[PDB]
Design a protein around this ligand. Structure first.
Ligand SMILES: O=P(O)(O)O[C@H]1[C@H](OP(=O)(O)O)[C@@H](OP(=O)(O)O)[C@H](OP(=O)(O)O)[C@@H](OP(=O)(O)O)[C@H]1OP(=O)(O)O
Ligand SMILES: [Mg+2]
Ligand SMILES: [Zn+2]
Lengths: 550, 134, 171, 108, 204, 134
RNA sequence: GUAUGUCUAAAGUUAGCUCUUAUUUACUAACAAACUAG
């Protein structure tokens, strides 16, 4: 195999065929089915065999979908601008798999509006009147027959724009053309093993789309930026006036390094090829950075366990079919204390199937709608998800919000027991429209104590409701004197009554924890908090090196 | 689509073969139109036509629904391989060649073959549309 | 010409803000309800001019720029029915002491409300069923984020909600 | 059209102009507000003193309704053989009652 | 870092480093716009008299030089605009120059002092204001840009204020655990109001 | 020709009841469609000529448009005309520094095909591939 | 999860035993820890 690798041209000539360059790897060296054991169906094992064929085809996809084709008709993918050279099925399924949710468009639009921000950042430098966002066609991001102008610059004083040159030409001619109006057109292409030279491509598309007898652009002067997605490349061809060429060079290196749209593309090519090397910058929640939650910023939890809840019932023939009941999205702000409880009505699921993944995408849609309703001075500077599978839809629907620090967690935060609470269950089930019901979790809890006390109280109460439900409900509903006010959730206890309730809930949690896992006691304090609510070994090292130094 | 809208919306080799020959003819006529409008040169018309008649298997997609077209496609490729090395003795490599005559003959001989084929196929299809299935 | 319109509409500006909760459902009084919804937002901004010295001196000009279309579209009855009814529901829940949470609930019936799938997930997954087209919307009962300029004042409404919370809190 | 008539005067409390021919129209024993109208387009509409909450799980025209001791739940049966116990303003049935030999449950 | 197998670490017979000659290296910098570097390299005839060719391949009509070449790749080879002196673009410049030669509610709505006359478009994420070259002062996975305010250098955030107050609180919980059922109540989030009011009492 | 052109222009709406039998004619003309394609591509205009005014049969309903005549050319004249275009295209590949090949397909998928009388008939055609004969 | 199947007023046709209640067992579920169908 060593001489096979040396005979295919080393590692470079192998990986030029592959989709390695489209993935984001800091080095090549970090490149290196639990469903078949489930009783499902004799026929469904065919799809189980189908699954790794997809990653084999996607790994060799630039050399399978390449342009040196003896005979082959250039069809287009569904809803993206990837041109197949023949109806190859698994390649087409893998390219639907990566480029779902109009991610191609959510690349294109994103880059376009990010250039807008740069041109809104650099107005006075280039003497720009008004960077005009153009209302473009909804299918403009993949119409490759002809295009239009994404961004149109207007100028105050007219511009001495050059003859068309690349982004990286060292000598230009700032004398020739004279216009008061640039434009910009971001292009995207899935480059393959043959047609991946991006400068030739963007020069061909710029000299193609200006030079039509049909007119689409407001001026013949513009810059057409083309990003090659499948080879991590970029180039911009067109007319350059003074100060725009280093600006667009630095801007394209900045975008191509750190666009969240391009990086969700790279993450999907990584996870679609089942390869990963993780260096988690600003890590997930632990018992170490547990107070990273309400560090006086604006933030929201997103719980998505009870979005798609079901009730099953027998259905006249023997099968037990599965109806979708009214669900919730438990959006908790820990610091200020609101609760953007989204009530998902059954009319969300009008004739839809594969409701689980579609529920994850609907939860991401509602979080994006909630954030878009908020101002950009109340746009939450981080979002803590609760489940790992939430990260793939949410990082797409928050592509419009690059300010927001999407963080995973490694705490099983017991917000799934929200249906155990009576009034949350009432406002979940009693709905006609898909409603946004609000609460304060912290209702009697913000005249006396801050967010830390009662967030830990809420964690204790909700883990007790999730562990043993009606026992903790009888502990809440013990003293018939202490009632619940109409806009509160929890009973209006005094503080020693809250100490009694918290002590009984903690004893309930650890009682059923011992009666489930027959473990004696927590032999460590952070282990006990971790049991109530990777870096476990790091906090072992931290307490070993901090409890010894006294 | 549904599956019911994928069963009625699949069609045979006949309808698609009509569709691909009309793709071919429309490429021919649209390059002559791009000439006649004044956009493109006559030399660039001849190279565009010789590009059509030697990339029918790429520009159109007739190879899918009738595979003996590959014979003519191979012959067109083979005529390409002759003509680009008698047109370019002292010219090297590049577009500009537009001696489209024998590939044009090859596609006309293909049409000579599949006039009665398409007559019988589309006669059976159109009589299923009007008269119905026997 | 124009200064007589200034005189007339400022003498009308100084001539009620308490929205009758019968007049919210009373669709016949749509111009009067739209004018009251205009003038109570003017009263919010007049209060926020006064306490600007210690609460966000950077967003007052931005909200004045952003409500200019809503001030355009409320004085001469230029809005949608459900949009105006939900806005009046907000501004009626914005005049009561403890109804700030009900004010933001009315805001979240304004911003999203009745319509399921507000943005649209737009053909996720592989299979893309035939019913899977009705769960995306660019138009045809998708949201009321149908414009930059429209959503701009919709956002400014909850800016004034947050100011109303802070203003009734520290007084 | 569903009309709520006083037994003492006989005045107009509500006039429910509906879409379908309504089935039996019943009331929850706790509240005079809480008020359930069966339809024949497979739906049931709960009301107050004015729509409150729909009910759509029967496939056929709904024939007859009941409640529990002092209400707090609800019983529905249709031209299908199914009987569904719904709750106080909850769409989801606790039990749906069906076998292969049942004709229907037209009254109960 | 042996994720490399045995056969890749096994070198060829003569002389990790022998592979590193797309790049195998860094690959997280997105690659440059390289491009249209072009080159044009270069008996007798009965018809014209010139040497090299015969009458069957002469280029003048029968009377009684620079080449698109130096090719290795495919995208260089097709290249509809390979040679380029700007002819068609200057023609369209000339066509464009020929074509180039040829109310009160605004005043009513200034009752408040404005006398001026799918994402937000005013977001400007702090990688866009990081437009000058830094050593990745942003990550797009967590979508968290580092500053000196709530940022460190493997690292965490600055727990500022409330986070520092909970640092005081769980160090107080550790002090009450390392000083003083009750075996379980020694920690903060176990019995939170207990240690919260003990820390409130401690400030008296 | 204007009678033919008016028939083809009146069959762009095709929404009245009167087109019913005419629409029958369209589905019947598909099994005579591909023959007409050969009758285009035989009578395809050569590079030395601008536009070849050709005889053609049209159905009364304008269903199918069979180009009528067959292209007969004298054999030595035919190979001399194609050799003149051969030498002319060799000269205009050599002396031309940049050759621009056509776009394919020349029009968009959304664009309808253009009418001859409003866009092509009023523009005079260009100069064809002709060697300068001394 | 498909194939596929089924329902859907806008338009008005003339005069020992009965019982509550829990444990166990069996068959089923695209219900949970982004993808799999004849
Ligand atoms: O890839 P190559 O082996 O170098 O051959 C190519 C190829 O011809 P093939 O179809 O036989 O592979 C090109 O055809 P396409 O890539 O377009 O299908 C053709 O270019 P054109 O068809 O556009 O003319 C070109 O010929 P040339 O570049 O000389 O015009 C010719 O190169 P060779 O002449 O070296 O065989
Ligand atoms: Mg089968
Ligand atoms: Zn010679």
């Amino acid at each position: 195999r060593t001489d096979v690798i040396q005979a295919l041209g080393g590692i470079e000539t192998i990986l030029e065929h592959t989709l390695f360059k489209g993935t984001g790897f800091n080095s090549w060296e970090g490149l290196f089915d639990s469903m078949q054991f489930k009783k499902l169906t004799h026929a469904q094992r065919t799809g189980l065999s189908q699954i790794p064929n997809r990653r084999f085809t996607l790994w060799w996809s630039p050399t399978i979908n390449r342009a040196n084709v003896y005979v082959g008709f250039l069809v287009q993918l569904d809803l993206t601008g990837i041109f197949l050279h023949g109806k190859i099925p698994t390649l087409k399924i893998s390219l639907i798999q990566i480029f779902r949710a109009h991610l191609w468009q959510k690349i294109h639009e994103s880059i376009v509006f990010d250039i807008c921000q740069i041109l809104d950042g650099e107005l006075d430098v280039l003497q720009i009147e008004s960077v005009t966002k153009e209302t473009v066609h909804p299918r403009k991001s993949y119409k490759m027959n002809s295009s239009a102008a994404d961004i149109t610059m207007e100028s105050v004083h007219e511009w001495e724009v050059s003859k068309p040159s690349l982004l990286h030409e060292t000598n230009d001619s700032f004398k020739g053309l004279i216009t008061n109006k640039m434009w910009f057109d971001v292009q995207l292409r899935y480059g393959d093993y043959d047609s991946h030279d991006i400068s030739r491509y963007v020069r061909a598309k710029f000299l193609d789309y200006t030079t039509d007898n049909v007119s689409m652009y407001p001026s013949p002067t513009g810059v057409m930026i083309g990003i090659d997605l499948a080879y991590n490349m970029y180039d911009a061809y067109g007319n350059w006036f003074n100060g725009l060429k280093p600006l667009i060079q630095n801007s394209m290196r900045t975008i191509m390094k750190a666009n969240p749209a391009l990086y969700v593309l790279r993450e999907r090519i990584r996870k679609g090829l089942q390869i990963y090397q993780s260096s988690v910058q600003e890590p997930f929640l632990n018992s170490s950075n547990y107070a990273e939650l309400f560090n006086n910023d604006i933030k929201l939890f997103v719980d998505d366990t009870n979005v798609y809840r079901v009730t099953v019932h027998k259905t006249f023939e023997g099968n037990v079919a599965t109806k979708a009941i009214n669900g919730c999205i438990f959006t908790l702000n820990p610091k200020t204390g609101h609760l953007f409880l989204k009530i998902i009505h059954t009319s969300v699921w009008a004739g839809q199937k594969r409701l689980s993944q579609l529920a994850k995408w609907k939860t991401a849609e509602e979080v994006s709608a909630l954030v878009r309703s908020l101002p950009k001075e109340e746009q939450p500077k981080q979002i803590i998800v609760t489940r790992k599978a939430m990260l793939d839809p949410l990082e797409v629907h928050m592509l419009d919000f690059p300010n927001i620090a999407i963080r995973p967690t490694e705490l099983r935060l017991p917000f799934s027991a929200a249906m155990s609470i009576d009034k949350l269950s009432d406002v979940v089930m009693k709905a006609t429209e898909p409603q946004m019901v609000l609460f304060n979790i912290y209702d009697d809890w913000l005249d006396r104590i801050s967010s830390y006390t009662a967030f830990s109280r809420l964690t204790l109460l909700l883990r007790a409701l999730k562990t043993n439900e009606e026992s903790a409900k009888m502990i809440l509903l013990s003293d018939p004197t202490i009632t619940i006010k109409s806009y509160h959730l929890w009973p209006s206890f005094t503080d020693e009554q809250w100490i009694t309730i918290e002590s009984q809930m903690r004893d309930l949690i650890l009682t059923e924890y011992g009666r489930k896992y027959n473990v004696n006691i927590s032999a460590l304090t952070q282990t006990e908090i971790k049991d109530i609510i990777p870096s476990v070994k790091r906090q072992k090292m931290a307490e070993l090196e901090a409890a010894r130094s006294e | 689509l549904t599956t019911k809208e994928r069963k009625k919306s699949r069609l045979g080799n006949s309808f698609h073969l009509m569709r691909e020959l009309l793709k071919m003819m429309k490429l021919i006529v649209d390059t002559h139109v791009q000439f006649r409008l004044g956009n493109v040169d006559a030399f660039q018309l001849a190279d565009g036509i010789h590009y059509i008649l030697n990339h029918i298997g790429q520009l159109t997609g007739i190879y899918r629904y009738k595979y003996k077209v590959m014979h003519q496609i191979r012959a067109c490729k083979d005529l390409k391989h002759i003509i680009y090395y008698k047109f370019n003795k002292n010219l090297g490599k590049g577009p500009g060649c537009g001696f489209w005559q024998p590939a044009w003959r090859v596609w006309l001989n293909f049409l000579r073959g599949t006039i009665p084929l398409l007559e019988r196929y589309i006669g059976n299809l159109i009589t299923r549309q009007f008269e119905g299935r026997s | 010409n124009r200064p007589e319109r200034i005189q007339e509409a400022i003498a009308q500006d100084k001539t009620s803000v308490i929205i009758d909760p019968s007049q919210i459902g009373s669709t016949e009084g749509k111009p009067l309800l739209s004018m009251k919804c205009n003038l109570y937002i003017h009263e919010i901004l007049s209060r926020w001019k006064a306490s600007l010295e210690a609460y966000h001196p950077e967003l007052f000009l931005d909200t004045k720029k952003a409500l200019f279309p809503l001030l355009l579209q409320l004085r001469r009855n230029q809005l949608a029915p459900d949009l105006l009814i939900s806005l009046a529901t907000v501004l009626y829940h914005l005049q009561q002491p403890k109804e700030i949470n009900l004010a933001v609930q009315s805001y979240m019936k304004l911003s999203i409300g009745n319509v399921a799938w507000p943005i649209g997930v737009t053909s996720v997954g592989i299979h893309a069923r035939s019913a899977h087209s009705k769960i995306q919307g660019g138009r045809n009962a998708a949201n009321i984020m149908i414009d930059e300029r429209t959503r701009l004042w919709i956002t400014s409404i909850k800016r004034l909600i947050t100011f109303e919370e802070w203003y009734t809190s520290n007084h | 059209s569903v009309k709520i008539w006083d037994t003492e005067t006989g005045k107009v409390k509500t006039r429910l102009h509906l879409n379908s021919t309504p089935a039996d129209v019943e009331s929850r024993p706790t509240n005079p507000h809480e008020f359930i109208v069966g339809l024949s387009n497979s739906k049931i509409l709960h009301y107050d003193d004015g729509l409150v909450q729909t009910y759509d799980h029967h496939l056929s025209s709904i024939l007859a309704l009941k409640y529990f001791p002092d209400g707090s739940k609800f019983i529905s049966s249709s031209e299908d053989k199914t009987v569904r116990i719904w709750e106080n303003q909850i769409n989801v049935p606790i039990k749906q009652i069906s076998d292969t030999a049942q004709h229907s449950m037209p009254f109960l | 870092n042996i994720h490399i197998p045995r056969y890749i670490r096994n070198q060829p017979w003569y002389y990790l480093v022998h592979h590193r000659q797309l790049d195998i290296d860094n690959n997280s910098e997105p690659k440059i716009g390289m491009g249209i570097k072009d080159e044009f390299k270069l008996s007798f005839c009965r018809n014209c008299g010139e040497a090299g060719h015969k009458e069957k391949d002469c280029m003048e009509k029968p009377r009684k030089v620079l080449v698109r070449a130096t090719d290795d790749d495919w995208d260089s080879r097709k290249d509809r605009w390979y040679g380029y002196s700007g002819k068609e673009y200057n023609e369209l410049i000339s066509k464009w120059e020929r074509d180039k030669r040829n109310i009160e509610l605004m005043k009513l709505e200034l009752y408040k002092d404005s006398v001026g006359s799918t994402r937000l478009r005013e977001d400007k994420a702090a990688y866009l204001n990081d437009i000058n070259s830094t050593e990745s002062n942003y990550d797009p996975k967590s979508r968290l840009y580092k500053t000196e305010t709530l940022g460190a250098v493997m690292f965490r955030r600055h727990l500022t204020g409330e986070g520092l107050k909970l640092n005081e609180l769980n160090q107080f919980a550790r002090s009450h655990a390392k000083e003083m059922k009750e075996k379980v109540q020694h920690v903060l989030v176990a019995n939170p109001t207990k240690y919260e009011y003990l820390k409130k009492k401690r400030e008296q | 020709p204007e009678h033919l052109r008016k028939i083809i222009n009146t069959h762009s709406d095709m929404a009245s009841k009167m087109y019913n039998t005419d629409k029958k004619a369209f589905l019947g003309a598909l099994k005579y469609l591909p023959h007409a394609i050969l009758k285009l591509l035989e009578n395809m205009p050569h590079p030395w000529e601008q536009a070849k005014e050709v005889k053609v049969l049209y159905h009364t309903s304008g269903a199918i448009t069979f180009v009528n005549e067959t292209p007969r050319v004298i054999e030595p004249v035919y190979t001399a005309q194609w050799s003149a275009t051969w030498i002319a295209m060799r000269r205009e590949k050599r002396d031309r520094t940049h050759f621009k090949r056509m776009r394919f397909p020349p029009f968009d998928d959304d664009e309808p095909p253009l009418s001859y009388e409003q866009h092509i008939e009023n523009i005079e055609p260009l100069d064809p591939i002709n060697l300068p004969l001394d």
